[PDB]
Amino acid sequence: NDKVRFIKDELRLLQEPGSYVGEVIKIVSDKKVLVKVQPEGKYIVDVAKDI
Amino acid sequence: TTAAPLLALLRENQDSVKTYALESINNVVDQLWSEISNELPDIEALYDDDTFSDREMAALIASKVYYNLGEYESAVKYALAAKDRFDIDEKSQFVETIVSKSIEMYVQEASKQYTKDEQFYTKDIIDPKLTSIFERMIEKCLKASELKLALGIALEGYRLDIIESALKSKLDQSTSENVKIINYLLTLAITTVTNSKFRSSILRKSFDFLMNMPNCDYLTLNKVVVNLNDAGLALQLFKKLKEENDEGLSAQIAFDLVSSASQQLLEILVTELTAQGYDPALLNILSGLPTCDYYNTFLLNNKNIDIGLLNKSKSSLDGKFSLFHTAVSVANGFMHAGTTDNSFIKANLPWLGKAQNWAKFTATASLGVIHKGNLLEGKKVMAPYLPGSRASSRFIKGGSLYGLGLIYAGFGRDTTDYLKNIIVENSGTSGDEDVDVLLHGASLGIGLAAMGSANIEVYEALKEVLYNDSATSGEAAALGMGLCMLGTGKPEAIHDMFTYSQETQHGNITRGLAVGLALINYGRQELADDLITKMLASDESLLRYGGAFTIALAYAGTGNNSAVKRLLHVAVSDSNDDVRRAAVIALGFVLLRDYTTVPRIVQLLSKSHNAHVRCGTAFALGIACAGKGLQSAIDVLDPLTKDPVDFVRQAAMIALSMILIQQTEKLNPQVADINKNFLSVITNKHQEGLAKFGACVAQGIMNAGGRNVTIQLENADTGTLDTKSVVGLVMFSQFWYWFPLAHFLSLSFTPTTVIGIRGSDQAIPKFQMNCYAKEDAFSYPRMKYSSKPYKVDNMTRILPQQSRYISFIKDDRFVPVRKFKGNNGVVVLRDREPKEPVALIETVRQMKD
Amino acid sequence: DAFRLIDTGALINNLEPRQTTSNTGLLNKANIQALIHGLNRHYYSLNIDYHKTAKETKMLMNLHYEEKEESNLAATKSMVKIAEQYSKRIEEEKELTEEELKTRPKKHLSETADETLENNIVSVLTA
Amino acid sequence: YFKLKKLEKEYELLTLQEDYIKDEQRHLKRELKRAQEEV
Fold first, then answer.
1. Alpha carbon B746 to chain centroid distance?
2. Rounded to a whole number, what is the distance in Å from the CA of D16 to chain A's nearest CA?
3. B388: left (phi over 0), alpha (psi -120 to 50) or beta
4. DSSP tag of A27
5. Separation of alpha carbons B237 and B212, rounded Å
6. I want to staple B583 with a disulfide (CB 3.0 to 4.6 A). Which of A9, B548, B566, D23 is the partner?
7. What stretches of residues are PC repeats (chain B)?
8. What are the φ/ψ torsions at residue D28 (nearest 5 degrees)?
9. How far is Cα B543 from Cα B610, in angstroms, rounded to an integer?
10. What residues contact residue C79 under an 8 Å CB cut-off, 6+ apart?
């Protein structure tokens, strides 16, 4: 049943915009990491609360 | 050692040789049984011989042939032919077995022959050889002085001869232990005996057992009558209590039969006792008029509810998103139920202006739940909303007619002629929009007023309403006729409502008739199988919806193993989401016998797919376990709270509201986190529309009546179900189609209090009661262990866990009769030496009469 | 999804139509779900339901002696290749068996064997 | 005698749970074939 429920609930995950790809350069004390995307430019984002 | 030499002497002709060779086999058995099986035809040949008189010993050995091979079918037959050769007092492995095997054959053959005739035990239909061995174990249990196995073995054997002989022989005087054994006979006739015919036969015999003894419990007398539902034996109770009338006897039977008796049972007690004479002061108590008046003062003065709870929830949303105007009246009617407080409606003017026709239809109908309990001012307070006075809309008059039946439900004999005359005048003239609105309202009010009534004129008045081909007023006529068909109902009404449902092109009328068919058969059990089969065989979507509720009401209370099996196959094979959820919610009505095993089935069905099913399984703990509650039911409904699906959260919050009624610290610690989540949904503005609807309903059910009332389908006195509470919950269990169906929940409100009555003046005294429940341990929420005692006067809030230690004080000269049975409710008191009145509590009846 | 115009008669200016509220939600995309009860005139959400009968159910059930002859057509041409059909399946299972020996797979071996089991039962049905 | 009849009622509860799981799990196979093809 859980296999059936996970497949029917995949539509919510398929509609998710997804994620980009980047590389870490440097960090600060504000928990803001510098991520360099290869096709795009650079973006300073916030690390996850679990990490 | 071989059996050949001993069995070779049976082929000759002699008197001594046949005897010596036969007795040698009876001595050595466990060694020689190998070769005896092959010689069995030679042993059984002498049994048919008339000149052979040793067949008693021969059949005894022949019985051991199949007994050593594992076949007990033929071992019992040949063992009975031994007669005196088979010793009962031997107590060997062979004796203690075959006798025990004969008991199993006695039960299987009795149940199969019980349907044909109930006298089989007297006649020769049953094997008399199995009866003689059955009565030997009865006398054996008498020597050990055990009445449980003596009276318990005759229940599954379907015999009334042993029960009458064994019980009457053990009666001594004193009589305190004899009533308890008879009380166990009724309890064992419910769970063990699933047949209604044999259960009613024991109730007829158990009533005469207590009448033969001069000292018998009067509460057990009504316990048998209500279970049997026979008004003939109830008349003998009042005749016995006529010349024997006491302050604590004739008054106790009057209030205990108010909620125990059905609508037809109350009509006979009033009519029969009228010609033979009756106490003029006790007239209204049989009908139940003062019963609702006694709790009007209790709810008004002791009301603990705060006005800020309904103010913060209502002011949170207004105007746009008008689907929330219904949830305002749902939480308003519950908290103010019985308190007759209209100040909240007139407090906020803009809330009345933003309400539309369907919103004002609910707001006008909210007066029926709030003002319920007062039958004199019911039509006086709602008079401007009643028809005859020009209003701004036709739906306002319809809301008053629906709220009219809320107060007068079951008492509507006074309002019957008012509502019926409107329907008759509107039966010949219809089809207009404004006319159908007045007819839709009157059909809802007459349903509760005529609820339980067998009157045909009421059913015929609402029968022609559906024939106008108008679905505006047709939705009310379908649900109105169902309340009149409760209990036995009309047999011709089954085929008429079922055939017309298939020929009806209206959506609301078709779904309404399916619910009405379930209200026709109540407690029929196997007698309703004719309608259940026809409804489940149809391919329609709405017809299969009401088929699940028919099994729920007919099998309600004590159920059958085949009833749940039918409900499981309908919620699986069928692809309709509305039919699947209807079968899983119907499981709560058949499990009402035991609330402990309810979550065992729910936890398996709560993890399935099709969230519509997970909603119906959520109320399965709210239909059954709401009367008591269990900590295991919270863990089942825990994952349903975090489900992001909108309509699932409504099923989780409402189900937890009924189980947590009157719960606080040192009782159910989980109520703190759950009750705060009800206000968190209202506080959070990011929730959807359906998410906030269940939050306002959950907070209103917990706080309903200032937390002075509880939702319970049954309490244990007689052992039956309340007609107003069980049927009223069926409509409350369905919120899906028409939003404010929660107004039917008011009939199921059970207040928990101890109200003493002085039998001398038939008034309410005031004195403190001794109890071990203290606020430091057992307390109630405001705005386990027992050590120190506590004292409180009459008309006070008492938890169901606090009602066990309640004890009256005799220093004020009040003699209790019922004392404490472990629950709340009115307990009639007595007076030792009447001189002058001590104290009196002024109720609402003093200002009226 | 459907979108109904306004014939009123239950409505006039602003009222609450559409009883029997259950089953699915709003969905749509953006602007239609923005205003539902406020402006119901030119657009509001709806639901879709389909009605069937007992006779209409078997009308689409005709997909499964005409089909009896067509069932033997697959086994008719297979009798020529019956030696080459089972040979290609056994030799395929031999290569899949050596795959598990070099592991120290099961899905590719199970799916290949499942197709061979059904083909052997159908051949027995011809007898 | 009271606990003796409770054992027979326990077998009825285990029978209802046994007949439901066998009917539901075999019904999941029809729903699994649909759920996999629809997604």
1. 17
2. 19
3. left
4. E
5. 13
6. B548
7. 362-395, 399-436, 441-475, 476-510, 512-545, 546-581, 582-614, 616-650, 651-688, 694-730
8. -65, -25
9. 20
10. none
